[PDB]
Structures are given as structure tokens and as C-alpha cells.
Swiss-Prot record, chain C:
This is Large ribosomal subunit protein eL18A. Belongs to the eukaryotic ribosomal protein eL18 family. There are 2 genes for eL18 in yeast. GO terms for biological process: cytoplasmic translation. It comes from Saccharomyces cerevisiae (strain ATCC 204508 / S288c) (Baker's yeast). The gene is RPL18A. The lineage of its organism: Eukaryota, Fungi, Dikarya, Ascomycota, Saccharomycotina. One of its GO terms (cellular component) is cytosolic large ribosomal subunit. The chain holds residues 2 to 62 of 186 of the full protein.
Swiss-Prot record, chain D:
The keyword Ribonucleoprotein applies. Disulfide bonds: none annotated. GO terms for molecular function: structural constituent of ribosome. It comes from the Eukaryota. It is found in: Cytoplasm. One of its GO terms (cellular component) is cytosol. Belongs to the eukaryotic ribosomal protein eL21 family. It comes from Saccharomyces cerevisiae (strain ATCC 204508 / S288c) (Baker's yeast). This is Large ribosomal subunit protein eL21A. Its main location: cytoplasm. Pfam families: Ribosomal_L21e. Component of the ribosome, a large ribonucleoprotein complex responsible for the synthesis of proteins in the cell. The small ribosomal subunit (SSU) binds messenger RNAs (mRNAs) and translates the encoded message by selecting cognate aminoacyl-transfer RNA (tRNA) molecules. The large subunit (LSU) contains the ribosomal catalytic site termed the peptidyl transferase center (PTC), which catalyzes the formation of peptide bonds, thereby polymerizing the amino acids delivered by tRNAs into a polypeptide chain. Keywords: Cytoplasm, Isopeptide bond, Ribonucleoprotein, Ribosomal protein, Ubl conjugation. The gene is RPL21A.
Curated annotation (Swiss-Prot), chain E:
Changing P55Q: Confers resistance to cycloheximide, an inhibitor of polypeptide elongation. It comes from the Eukaryota. Its main location: cytoplasm. Component of the ribosome, a large ribonucleoprotein complex responsible for the synthesis of proteins in the cell. The small ribosomal subunit (SSU) binds messenger RNAs (mRNAs) and translates the encoded message by selecting cognate aminoacyl-transfer RNA (tRNA) molecules. The large subunit (LSU) contains the ribosomal catalytic site termed the peptidyl transferase center (PTC), which catalyzes the formation of peptide bonds, thereby polymerizing the amino acids delivered by tRNAs into a polypeptide chain. This is Large ribosomal subunit protein eL42A. Component of the large ribosomal subunit (LSU). Mature yeast ribosomes consist of a small (40S) and a large (60S) subunit. The 40S small subunit contains 1 molecule of ribosomal RNA (18S rRNA) and 33 different proteins (encoded by 57 genes). The large 60S subunit contains 3 rRNA molecules (25S, 5.8S and 5S rRNA) and 46 different proteins (encoded by 81 genes). InterPro entries: Ribosomal_eL44, Ribosomal_LSU_eL42, Ribosomal_zn-bd. Keywords: Antibiotic resistance, Cycloheximide resistance, Cytoplasm, Methylation, Ribonucleoprotein, Ribosomal protein. It comes from Saccharomyces cerevisiae (strain ATCC 204508 / S288c) (Baker's yeast). One of its GO terms (cellular component) is cytosolic large ribosomal subunit. Belongs to the eukaryotic ribosomal protein eL42 family. Present with 13600 molecules/cell in log phase SD medium. There are 2 genes for eL42 in yeast. In wild-type cells, 78% of L42 is monomethylated at both Lys-39 and Lys-54, and 22% are a mixture of species with either residue monomethylated.
RNA sequence: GGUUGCGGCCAUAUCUACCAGAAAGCACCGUUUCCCGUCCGAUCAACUGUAGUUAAGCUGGUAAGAGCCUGACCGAGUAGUGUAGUGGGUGACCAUACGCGAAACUCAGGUGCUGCAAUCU
RNA sequence: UGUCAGGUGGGGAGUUUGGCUGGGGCGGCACAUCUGUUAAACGAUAACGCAGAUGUCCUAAGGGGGGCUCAUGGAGAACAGAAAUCUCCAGUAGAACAAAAGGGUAAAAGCCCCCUUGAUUUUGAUUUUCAGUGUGAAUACAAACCAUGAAAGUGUGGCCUAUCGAUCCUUUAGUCCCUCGGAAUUUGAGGCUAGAGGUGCCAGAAAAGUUACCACAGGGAUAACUGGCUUGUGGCAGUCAAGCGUUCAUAGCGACAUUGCUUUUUGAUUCUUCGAUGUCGGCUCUUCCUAUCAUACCGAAGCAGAAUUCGGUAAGCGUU
RNA sequence: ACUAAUCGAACCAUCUAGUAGCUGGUUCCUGCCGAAGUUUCCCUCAGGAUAGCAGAAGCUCGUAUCAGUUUUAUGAGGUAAAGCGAAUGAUUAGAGGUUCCGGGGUCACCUUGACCUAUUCUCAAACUUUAAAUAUGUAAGAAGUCCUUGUUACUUAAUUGAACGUGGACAUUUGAAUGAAGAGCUUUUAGUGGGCCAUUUUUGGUAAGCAGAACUGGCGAUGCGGGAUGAACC
């Protein structure tokens, strides 16, 4: 009938049982939501610098 | 309704619930007069200051203050006359106590739900006090001292808990110790203001300091 | 009575022997167990722990 | 009933400080934010456009995006047993540079500087910081400084 | 709520691609137009025995309709839809407000 | 060092009274053809830097000034609080141990500081 | 008479008759949302906790720009009075900002004035609720086209925090696009992309009662008995003493408070019992408690005697 | 009411082993690991799905991209406290001062009806200047620091800058402390989704072995020594 509405008891026990863990930040994060003006550059800048090193590699 | 015994609301269980725009329908406090005796005497007329101080942290019901105030006045008045003292009820009845209204009639279980929506309606007022806070302050001439302590002793009996009669070293209701206030009053930095006194500060516009306190500048110069 | 920071008696979680029944595939493990142990070359250690992989973990090349 | 609106329980988090109401000082829009900068979040309530949620006030995270008037900040968030990544649209009025990171940066220039002279002379220049070490021995003289005794003071009502 | 009979809004009419003048009207649902796929199915399901076979709405909570505006480009005759918020009472371009006006009753 | 234009921090700059201001500058100030605007060239706009002028404004100074900003071994290690106890207390609460530690109050100071550019006895 | 159609038709048939809930029913909405507090200075946090509010309103009460400062107070000005309009001074906001509250706002986010429709299109990403799902709301952008401004810039509705709705079906718009599969055309239908018609039980069944004739599954997850916790309520006791008591507080009472005990009431609760603890009263019968009505022995009195009143030891003995 | 001891719908057989979110039962041992009663949604509250907690299968590597931790530095908060001679709201006592917007008593006539100022007392969950303690965000590098100059349709007045770079130099310490029990990732599934108590902070109630919450730890699932005895206390 009348049941307890809410109880955060043992909630932090549970989270720390498996450890509270960072998202393990990687180099080169996703360019997701990054300024579309900036992104439409970085494609071309990378395209230019790759061929430049390719031409440098001959 | 019959007044609930004070044993119920003795302690500071609940957070302060004063008269405000969220606390609309409340009765008024029983105590209305807070300064008694020769209340308009100057500060020097009543040098000795006695305090009735609670040693514990409870709630003084508003009307208990009124109840003790009439008793403290009544012994004091009849022993040393009307104008030999001035008592001030320091603490004030701001905490509004709550009562859950109940039906105790025949078979009241039907018409009443019990504890569903059991937020209590305002029952009265009380004065919240902590340890060491002054309840009553009487100021009088020093020879009157036996009378005021005994008179305060009769008032102590209307209060729950334990209270103490302390002979304060202050000069009356002032915040100055007796020997050094005498130096201040003698040096002339003190103008009465009906019931209390004005102090001359070393900081301020000198012209105003001269306006209120010519005697200090004359006393130093002379 | 000690506190236990980690799970006790925790199996290493890695295959130690091929839980296939294949006798020939255990002969190769017997050979490479000897080579991995009796040599300092990391290559034998690698191949020994690649012989235990399941069929899904041994994809065709 | 119960409310959990976008800005509930913010009676005091978005109050402008005492005598600090009104116009935001103009250095705010002048600070330059580059992707990788570590910034904290202190939402000055005066600017209503682009406020962060009340959870991020005080949370310090890196800037991943830089926009016309806003910058994009990454903040780790407590959700269950894992940290999530939260990319925020933040008007620059609500952020400021973190002074913790610049202290580390200026230290790095200090570490590089003293290591440079260590290359020439004085090897083992002791790069790493040292916490407060236990204090060494010393002599405490008494010329004119005889130890004056103290006694516990008797209880007085003082009232 | 009052909105004018005209509005200069966008027109993606493949020819305009720019803010153009519009004539605007209140959305009309239109005739139910039996032979619709649901109506053909519903008539087949309702015919026979068993009475009512699909739910019939009974409980009404809202009292408004989100008024939709039938934007109509004056040049290319392209019709577009714009939605407004809920409104108890709605008018189309009438009695333009004037601030410093008397208390006419 | 003063002034102006633009400012940074945003009262140490504010506020209320009094005093002072060489040179320059600022402003007040003079007039409505054009522009422009208002009930009203008072605002704004234009034009003369010409008739004058520190009275303003402004700037600086003065006040046992309020305020504001710092500090203080002044309050106060106070209130409060984290941890612990088979601590006291009927309870209310309180003391203790290991820590952290205020605010009001009082006292002592101070009253803008600079940045770019031009200019000035 | 046969078929079809319209009505009538609890005669009869099937089915339903929400949830939460200090048992249920009544009430209410705590069922979707919002503000402050509770909420214990990150966050999160409940109750049928408290104060309240929402299902709208606005072509302006949106957007931009320009001018000015508001509430109030004071001084004044024929009618003019506290309050008709004008003028000046002080005016840190004490006003206004559509609507609840809170936050925010001074050459403004307020009042007045000018122009306008960005309250538009394409989608995508992000924040809150969160499963990092949806809806809702919001932030930043990009590609466009517009609005305003001298420009910078601002604007993707209301200063911000609420103001709202899935699949199916209908309908409207767009793409003039796809399909109708034996070719073709046109109506017609079905698709794709944008909305609307609503589901407030608000992640969304289409749904009226009774059972004191009842039945089943169970439930002490939940009442009616008792017992237990507490004692508000009832009773009983105590401290102080303004007074009554001719005089006198305390012979006897005792207002105003205030401290306790009891489970001889009624409470509040749901811990035990729902695969049963036989549910009031009376008849009868025993024992126990003392908070004593009488009796034994006393003390006190405004007790001369007698009647009485209070109190002590005392439950042995009686109490029709 | 009665209708074969059966009646508010007989009896017999079948569909039928009808349905059950409900009750009871669910059979050998040992070993290792080992919980949950909470989120959200549901005509949902005796039940499910989903996340969480647990097992197993492991997989990639080999002391780290780590941590229920501290220090240092830098943020954020508005609770406790404190404050009303500080704002709003209240509030006790007085003291000093008014337009013809009231003298009510002789026309401007002392004239008791104001507010304003300097004090005084006590406050506040929906007040606050200020403001702790605890708890809380980030950082403490080799994915970094510095130098050189290449790409870009982006940005700047610019061959300025932004991002990514290219090549060069960066051990006693590769840039605080302590520890690491290996670290990281995946799959999959069981059970659970009725909780209860203790300290402290708490809300409603007079109070409760009352109802609801926050942190922590326990009992559930746990024996053993103590509290004569008891799930929680030591
Ligand atoms: Zn068009």
C-alpha cells in the first residue's frame, strides 16, 4: 500500500563498488559540435598538409 | 480549546516560525508591556543591574513571560514601592507554536483522518532562548538589591528549566563596567536621552561633538 | 580479518590452456609451453597465448 | 507538487554580488579563449541569454569550442557509476579563465628555466615540488625574552 | 491573439528562396473525404456484428487548438504552414492597436 | 605635474559642507542662414571661437565627516563545525581529544590607481 | 413471406466501472508542469510538508534603434481639496517588466517615440528532466533570406525560470517526386518530407453502480479485538502564590502559569494475528492494585459537642 | 425458494492440464565469487521493462590515461554562525524637532492626533552585509615545454591569427604525496527492484519501537566475545 517514496541509501556504495571512473580521455576528441565554419576549414588544411608531406616524401 | 501543557513545547524542536506573510492567521501575544517600574529614570538613578538568565536552551511560552512579569512586578512593587526599579523583559515572543486541531468526540475516527495533512494551526507564541541569554533585566539602586533578587526568584518559578540570578557588573542597562563608567560619567561624555545615555566617540565631526558634549571639551581644557 | 581492496581468489581471467579437447592442438601447446618457458624470446610467449584463443578470437587470415 | 525547472533552487546562485549588480565589466568580452584553455563557470545572473545549468556553476573544464559570442566547454558529470561528457553552449559572460592552470604553466616555465641553467652547471636541480617538510632544529635565545609564565584564568561571569 | 492578414516571411517555392509577401488564413481541416485508406478499412471492420470495434474518443481535456496559418505567397501561389501557440480566441488581422488612444467602450 | 579624447580595475574613486585653480585645456558661454528637433534653438542640430567668464561644471584640497577599502596578537581561538568516546547530563544539551575556524564590535591606517595618444609656463 | 435500411429495444448478451492514499470510502491531486522553502553552502533528495501558481495572454505585452527616468518625499502653482495638471529639487531602484514567486534590469530588460515581422526555411549538435530515451523547454551555431540600426551588433518569439502530447487514422502543405508490378493516359489511392485534429489517468485503454445472497485467489504489504510504543485527550498528583477565606495566601481553596504519573477513556500507529485468537453487555467466580468510600489507630481545621473537611500508616476487611 | 443431501443459475463429460501480476512446494555434496530492495516509465504501488549492484566467458596489454586519499594552487556555494545604531519584514522603551495636508482650548494664539532624526531591547525556513566547518570542481606535463616555418576555400589591413602540423633540444625528479591489491575493454545472464536500524543533520506530529528525508555504517545475508536475554549497540 504505502511504499517508501525514495531512498538514496546504498546508492553511493553501489557506484563505488565498480569504482567511479573517468571517461578515459583520448587524444583527438571528436570534432562533434565544433564550429562548422572551423570544421570546414580543418578538412582542407589537413588535405593540404597531407599532400605537402606526401610531396615532401616524393 | 484548553491550553496544551507547556511540557509539550518545552524544547527547540522546530525551526523558527514567526509572524510573517506566510503565517497569516495567528493570535496575538499575551505579553504586551516589556518595561516596568520607574522606566523613565535616568541611568545613574539605577546603578545596579540584575539579570535572570536561562542556563539551558528551551522555549519560554509567550504567556509564561507575562505570567512571570506580573509576579516579578508585584513582589517588587509592594516591597520597595512603584518607582524603585525598572525591569525589562529582554526576550520577545516571536516563535509561533503550532497545534494540530483534534476531534475527541464520540466516534471521531470517522469525520477526522488522523495524520493525513496534519500540519498544525497556530496555537500561540513563545520566546526562543539559548544558554546564557538574559531573560529578565532589573535595574535599581544598590540598597534595593535583596528585594530584586527575591522578586526575581519568585519569577524564576514560572519558567521551565533552570535560571540563574546573576549580579551583572555593568552599570545598569549600559554596556560598561561600574568602575570605568564612573570615569566616563565624571569626565562628562554622557548625555541622557530619556531612559538611556549617549556616548562621545573619538571619531566624528568635532562641531557636532561640541554641540552634544561641551562639558568634555571644557573638562579637559580646565 | 583484513579489508580486501580487490576481489579475492580472482581468477586471472585469461585462458591458460586450450579448453578444446584436440590432442594435436595440445601437442603444439606442449611444445610452445616448453619454448616460451625455456627461452627469453617474447615471440614464443605471444604465440603460446594465441594458441588458446577461441574460434571467434582466431579469425581467418 | 514538486518542480525541477531549468533554473530551480537558484535563489542565490544567480544573484549578482553586493554592489556588483548592473553592467558586467568590459574585460569579460576582451579575454581571449583558445581551444584547450581551462575555464571555470560562474554565471553572472545579469546576462540571461546563454546561462549554464545550475549544476555547472563552479565546475571547471576545458574549452573545446569557440564561437562568435559563446565558447564550448567540456565538463565531466557524475551520473551513476560513470562520468559523462557535457558539451555546453556558454556565453562568455558566465566564464573566466582558471587561475589554477596558469600557475602550473608559469611553474613549467620556471622548471624549464632552472633546468636550463642546470644544463650548464649544477646538475640535479630538483624539479619536483616539496610539501611542507618537518621543521629543522634551531636555537631559541632569551636575550630580553625570559619566558613569562601564564596561569589559567578564574571563571568570571563577564555579563 | 491577433495576427495580420499579411506577413513578409520566407518562401521556399524553389523560385523565391527569399522573404516574400504572403497572404495568410486560418487553417481549415477540410472534408473527411471518405475512400481514405483508414475509412475503407474502418467500414470493412465496422460492417457486421460486434458493434464498435475501434476506440471512440470520449475524454476531452484541452479547450484550444494550435492555430495553423495557411501562408500563401502572393507571387508563385505556394502555400506553407506556420503554427502558433494555443489560444482560446483568435482573430485574423483586425483592430490594429493604438497606444495613446482614449477609453472607448 | 595639470588638461583633453579613449579607457582598465570599478566608491581608496562615492556622498554632504567649505576653500583653491597660474598656463593650456575643458566647460559655461554668443547666434539661429542650412540640417535637425522640440509646447519652447531649454535638449538636440548648425555656426562663431567671436562678446565674456571661473560664478559654475570639472580638477585638487580641507572634515577628530558619514561611507568605502585594507590590516590588527581588538573581539576570538569566541560562536560554529568535522571526527571519537561504554564522556557527563533524566533530558535539554554541555565538556573534553584531535582539527578547521568566523561575523558583529574596537583600534590603526588610506581616500584612487594606472594604460594609449595629443597638449600645457 | 424473403433481403436491406432507420428507429425502438437492460427483455437479453458481453464488458468496464482509474491510481495515489498513515486501512479503504469522502475529500484532495501531492497524477503533466513552475517559483520560494523544507534541502542540512557542489549536485541529487521525500511526505496528502508549508506559501503559491499553470493549462492562458500578446501583431505587440516580439525584434532593432532613439529620447528620457521610475515608486516616493519635499517645496510650490485660480478653481484644485489627501488625490484633476503643471514646475523644480532629493530620489541604488524602495517602481515597471501580461499573468504565481524568485532572480535580473538605470543614457536599461522600465515609460514614450520610429521602423518592422526573425513568432521565417533547411536540418544537425548541445543543456535540463534522463535510461544520458522521447516529449516539452532552452543555448550556441552554419547555410539562406530578411528586420532594425549610422554602424558595431542584435533578432530563430515574449528578460529568465511553467504555459504542454506518441503509434494508428483523418486532413493540410511541400517535393510534381515515387508506385498502382501485362503495357499506356487521366481521375483515384498509397508513399516520402512539415504541421494540425489528442489523448490533463498529461510516455497517451474507448468504460456507469450495487452486492446486507455472494464466490475465488490471496493479504496481517491493510482496518475492525486485544496487547506494545507514546499520553495529545481524560483522570490523578505536585511546585509558586495574585486573591477568596471578617481580619490572614497556604484551615480549606486557589487564578496566572509550570513539573510529573497512569494506561481505569478517546486518541494517533499498523509492530503481532486475515490457511479465524469466537466479537458488547449481563449471570457467576477468583485474585490483584491503591489513586481509601466505611471500619482500626492517628495529625490538622475558621474542629466547643455532634456532624463534617483535609491529610498519614493502612487494601485486613467490607462496598447492597 | 425448490429443481435428487448440489441452486443468486443443477448435474455429467468434453474444450481443459482453462487462467493466474496470488499461496504452498521445488529432491546430492563440495569449492570459488557473491548482492539487491534505488533511478526512470508503465490503469503502475503484491508486477514488469530499463539503469544500477553480481557471476561467468573472456579479450588487449604489462605498471600505466589510476584512486570513496591527502598537500599545494586556484575556483564555486549562502548552510551553521553573525547582523539589525545595514536593505525588506517585524519589533519594546523613551529623547529631540511640523505646511495654514486636521489645534479638539482665546484667529497667528503652550496647546498632546503626526512623521523625521540620534539611541535602546529582541528577532526571522520562504530576510540579509558578512560568513565558516565538512563536503565539492580543476591542475600538478613527454598527448607536455621551447624554437624553425608549411597547409587552409577560415580569420586579420596584412604573407596577422586559429587549428593541425614538419624538423631541432629537453634522467639523476618525465616536474606534489601515498598506494596499486595488475590495468583497460567487451559480451552475457542470474537474483533484486517490500527493506529495517544506529550516530549525526533533519521535516510533519505533543510524542511514539510513528511517517518521511541527507551522510555514513550495519542487520537483511553474519556467525564469534560482551550488553543476564535481543537482527542492528560495543
Ligand atoms: Zn513564393
Amino acid at each position: 500500500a504505502k511504499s517508501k517514496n525514495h531512498t538514496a541509501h546504498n546508492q553511493t556504495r553501489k557506484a563505488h563498488r565498480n569504482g567511479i571512473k573517468k571517461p578515459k580521455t583520448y587524444k583527438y576528441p571528436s570534432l562533434k559540435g565544433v564550429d562548422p565554419k572551423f570544421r570546414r576549414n580543418h578538412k582542407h588544411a589537413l588535405h593540404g598538409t597531407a599532400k605537402a608531406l606526401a610531396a615532401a616524401k616524393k | 480549546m484548553a491550553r496544551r501543557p507547556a511540557r509539550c513545547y518545552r524544547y527547540q524542536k522546530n525551526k523558527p516560525y514567526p509572524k510573517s506573510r506566510y503565517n497569516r492567521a495567528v493570535p496575538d501575544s499575551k505579553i504586551r508591556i516589556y518595561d516596568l517600574g520607574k522606566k523613565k529614570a535616568t541611568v545613574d538613578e539605577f546603578p545596579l543591574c540584575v539579570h535572570l538568565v536561562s542556563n539551558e536552551l528551551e522555549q519560554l511560552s509567550s504567556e509564561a513571560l507575562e505570567a512571570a512579569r506580573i509576579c516579578a512586578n508585584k513582589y517588587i512593587t509592594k516591597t520597595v514601592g512603584r518607582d524603585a526599579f525598572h525591569l525589562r523583559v529582554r526576550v520577545h515572543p516571536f516563535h509561533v507554536l503550532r497545534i494540530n486541531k483534534m476531534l475527541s468526540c464520540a466516534g471521531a475516527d470517522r469525520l477526522q483522518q488522523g495524520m493525513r495533512g496534519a500540519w498544525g494551526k497556530p496555537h500561540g507564541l513563545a520566546a526562543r532562548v539559548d544558554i546564557g541569554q538574559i531573560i529578565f533585566s532589573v535595574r535599581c539602586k544598590d540598597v534595593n538589591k535583596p528585594v530584586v533578587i527575591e522578586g526575581l526568584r519568585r519569577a524564576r518559578y514560572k519558567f521551565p528549566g533552570q535560571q540563574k540570578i546573576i549580579l551583572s557588573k555593568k552599570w545598569g542597562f549600559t554596556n560598561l563596567d561600574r568602575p570605568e563608567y564612573i570615569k566616563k560619567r565624571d569626565a562628562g561624555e554622557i548625555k541622557d536621552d530619556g531612559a538611556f545615555v549617549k556616548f562621545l566617540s573619538k571619531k566624528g565631526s568635532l562641531e557636532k561633538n561640541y554641540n552634544e558634549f561641551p562639558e568634555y571639551f571644557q573638562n579637559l581644557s580646565a | 580479518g583484513i579489508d580486501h581492496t580487490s576481489k579475492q581468489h580472482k581468477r586471472s581471467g585469461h585462458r591458460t590452456a586450450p579448453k578444446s579437447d584436440n590432442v594435436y592442438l595440445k601437442l603444439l601447446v606442449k611444445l610452445y609451453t616448453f619454448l616460451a618457458r625455456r627461452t627469453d624470446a617474447p615471440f614464443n610467449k605471444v604465440v603460446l597465448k594465441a594458441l588458446f584463443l577461441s574460434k571467434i578470437n582466431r579469425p581467418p587470415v | 507538487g514538486k518542480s525541477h525547472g531549468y533554473r530551480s533552487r537558484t535563489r542565490y546562485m544567480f544573484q549578482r554580488d553586493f554592489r556588483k549588480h548592473g553592467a558586467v565589466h568590459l574585460s569579460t568580452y576582451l579575454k581571449v579563449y583558445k581551444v584547450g584553455d581551462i575555464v571555470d563557470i560562474k554565471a553572472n545572473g545579469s546576462i540571461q541569454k546563454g546561462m549554464p545549468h545550475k549544476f555547472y556553476q563552479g565546475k571547471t573544464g576545458v574549452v573545446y569550442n569557440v564561437t562568435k559570442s559563446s565558447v564550448g566547454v567540456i565538463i565531466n558529470k557524475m551520473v551513476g557509476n560513470r562520468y559523462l561528457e557535457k558539451r555546453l553552449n556558454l556565453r562568455v559572460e558566465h566564464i573566466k579563465h582558471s587561475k589554477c592552470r596558469q600557475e602550473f604553466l608559469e611553474r613549467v616555465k620556471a622548471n624549464a628555466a632552472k633546468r636550463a641553467e642546470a644544463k650548464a652547471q649544477g646538475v640535479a636541480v630538483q624539479l619536483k615540488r616539496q610539501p611542507a617538510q618537518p621543521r629543522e632544529s634551531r636555537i631559541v635565545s632569551t636575550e630580553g625574552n625570559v619566558p613569562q609564565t601564564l596561569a589559567p584564568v578564574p571563571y568570571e561571569t563577564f555579563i | 491573439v491577433n495576427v495580420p492578414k499579411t506577413r513578409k516571411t520566407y518562401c521556399k517555392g524553389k523560385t523565391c528562396r527569399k522573404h516574400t509577401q504572403h497572404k495568410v488564413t486560418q487553417y481549415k481541416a477540410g472534408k473527411a473525404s471518405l475512400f481514405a485508406q483508414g475509412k475503407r478499412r474502418y467500414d470493412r471492420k465496422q460492417s457486421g456484428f460486434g458493434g464498435q470495434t475501434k476506440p471512440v474518443f470520449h475524454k476531452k481535456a484541452k479547450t484550444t487548438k494550435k492555430v495553423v496559418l495557411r501562408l500563401e505567397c502572393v507571387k508563385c501561389k505556394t502555400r506553407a504552414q506556420l503554427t502558433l501557440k494555443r489560444c482560446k480566441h483568435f482573430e485574423l488581422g483586425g483592430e490594429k492597436k493604438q497606444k495613446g488612444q482614449a477609453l472607448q467602450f
